[PDB]
Design a binder for this molecule. Sequence first.
Ligand SMILES: Nc1ncnc2c1ncn2[C@@H]1O[C@H](COP(=O)(O)OP(=O)(O)O)[C@@H](O)[C@H]1O
Ligand SMILES: [Mg+2]
Lengths: 193, 70, 32, 524
Amino acid sequence: LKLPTAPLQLSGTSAQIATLLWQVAAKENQLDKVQDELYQFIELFKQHSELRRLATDPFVPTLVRTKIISSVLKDSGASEITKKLFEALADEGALSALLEVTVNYEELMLAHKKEVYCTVITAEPLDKLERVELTKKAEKFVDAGFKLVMQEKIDKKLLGGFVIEFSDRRVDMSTAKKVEEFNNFVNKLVLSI
Amino acid sequence: EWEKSYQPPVIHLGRVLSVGDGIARVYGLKSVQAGELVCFDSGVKGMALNLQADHVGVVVFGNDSVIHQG
Amino acid sequence: ADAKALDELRKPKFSSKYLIQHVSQKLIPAVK
Amino acid sequence: PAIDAGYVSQVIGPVVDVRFDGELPSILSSLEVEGHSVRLVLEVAQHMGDNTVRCIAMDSTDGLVRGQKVVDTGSPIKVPVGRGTLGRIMNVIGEPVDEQGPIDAADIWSIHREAPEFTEQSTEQEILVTGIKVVDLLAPYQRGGKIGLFGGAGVGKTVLIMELINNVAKAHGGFSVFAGVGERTREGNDLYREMIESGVIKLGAERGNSKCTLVYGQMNEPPGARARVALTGLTVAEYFRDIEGQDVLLFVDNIFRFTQANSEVSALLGRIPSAVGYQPTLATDLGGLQERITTTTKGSITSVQAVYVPADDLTDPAPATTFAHLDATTVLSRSIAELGIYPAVDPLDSTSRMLNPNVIGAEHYNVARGVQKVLQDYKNLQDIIAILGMDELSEEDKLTVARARKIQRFLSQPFQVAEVFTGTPGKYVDLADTISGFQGVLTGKYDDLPEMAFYMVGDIKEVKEKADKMAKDIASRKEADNKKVSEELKDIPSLDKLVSEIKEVVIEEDDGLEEDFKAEALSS
Ligand SMILES: Nc1ncnc2c1ncn2[C@@H]1O[C@H](COP(=O)(O)OP(=O)(O)O)[C@@H](O)[C@H]1O
Ligand SMILES: [Mg+2]
């Protein structure tokens, strides 16, 4: 009908569930409420073997699976969205799809909190000024006014400077790449002259 | 003039999902073009053949023995 | 779904427990 | 720009999935990809089911990214039609590819329509004289009917279609449409250049007196363009039939390449393959196209289309399906061409619905069936002649062996378009000249002539001139040959005079390849 448009478009049938789960929770302003209930269910599948039996065992009947999930969620203050969600997955036997639904629910929340997780690997630990200087140039790399969070790593094989690891791309603006980008450039040119 | 015009370009990554029967399946590489020359970390080149919704089918210009999952 | 986003879900991330504890008086009577 | 604009989901060769956030386009509607190296036009083939359409690209998909915005044009591929498209070359999507400017649009018509209904069909059979002896005798073409020319890989179905362009179209009156589908670009540049020499295509200021539209989807194009350029060619021809209401000629070189191009796309459209590897929808893809090429009551389309046979196989499903759609069939054989008989028409495989004694006449029909009976009887004798020899048949048999060897050579003919590589001048044989020419061979008026007098001549007068010439050349013989070549007074110079006339060319110092590469590149 008239659902809010998702922050970024995703894969098939397990990200399609989470995109619809996101669009419903944004129409109802429960985007962090059902996100936490998803995380609560991942731990709840970890505590009990009788709850992951309703997601892997092929001999648990459909009637037992849909009655038990509705029974333990008739109460307990869960969302109207996640109560309808879990009885929908328990009818179809797709309760094992929860663990991949929620990681697509994460990156929809990440592209709505306006956020990018990264990893900065440097040579020495940073200043109160080095942290502001590379952050001021790392707004050029994220494709919005996104909030880069941070992450600080240490390696001495870099000769000062930094690299970024954006979990899908990297920027090697260290000096150690700059010296072999120098050397392979100056060796390329003297064999031209 | 090389150093006054020097920005180290952002390197787009991708994991290998699956390799064998001469074609690697590659997670990621979201802005890769159809028909693009990709470079594996073993040095072996590849061609982005099938852009799919979830992976990129890459035909491997060389031996697929040097490509692993990940 | 990738693996590096899915391997970080073995760690607990809930930080709220109005459901994980609200089934002990509901789960084992229902499966029995 | 949020709605009515979708984005590329996935690119599998020429097959692009586009995802729309709302109000998906219709099937057969054309979409436009934003920000490509050339104009990339998609055409919606399927609705995949999760707000995804599956499209076929009319150009290359190399350089497509899975986020690229695709806008909907809200209509199918629409090409310019009218008298402003005569003399121009168009591609599959209607763009001019002859560098003569933009195309004058009398209308902009969609390339997809339904076939004309049963009430609009025409039932009128008049002959089309072609000037070709084997065509006018044994399988005559219908003026307003569908003609197919079957054969594979160098038997001559392009030389035959150029001869029908030369003979039929110049004495036709109306407009022609040539639809080059999956053929050579050298071969389509040859046709465009000789149609300017012939005045069929006039350029620049006198362009409206042109009588041919060329629509080219040649064999360098991706399979989306070749699968749809036969439909662009009809839409030009359907406009002159439906709106202008006149008789047109549609020459489609290799309508098989429409079938082959749909079979490359259909591997990637997610389908179970049919027989020998073709798409499951072969007969309806071909049939939905061929049923538009008809004569209606408002106008006529005389179509001649070459049909390639793969690996010289006529039972292959793409030739075998095309056989039903044609009024006249002309099957060209490789075994006939290796005998030197040109046009290499199989006279015992070429059929027409005009070969009917109520249509062509009584004595035309009887000469034609009489020729086919002599050629069938000689075909039945081929194995016993092969292993026992000529000297073991009956005299009644070896009378028809010599008569069928005469009508085999006499069905061959020099074409006017083959003069450039054969040297023999072409021959437009009249229909009366080939009926009475072939009536004489069946009765026995020319049993005494040799066989090779019948080979590569126009009519029955020219077998008598070639026999007189053949007999004379083994009679004409001269003593001491009348050279007068030695002792020629002041015409033949010396060698060293003639060597001195040679303007000695200079050599520009060893290939010069560095000065004209380093001039312009500065990047690697
Ligand atoms: N009528 C003809 N006379 C002489 N040679 C011919 C004739 N028709 C075809 N050929 C020979 O066959 C070759 C291939 O013919 P072509 O028209 O290119 O066939 P296709 O289009 O089927 O490949 C030509 O190069 C020519 O040498
Ligand atoms: Mg040809």
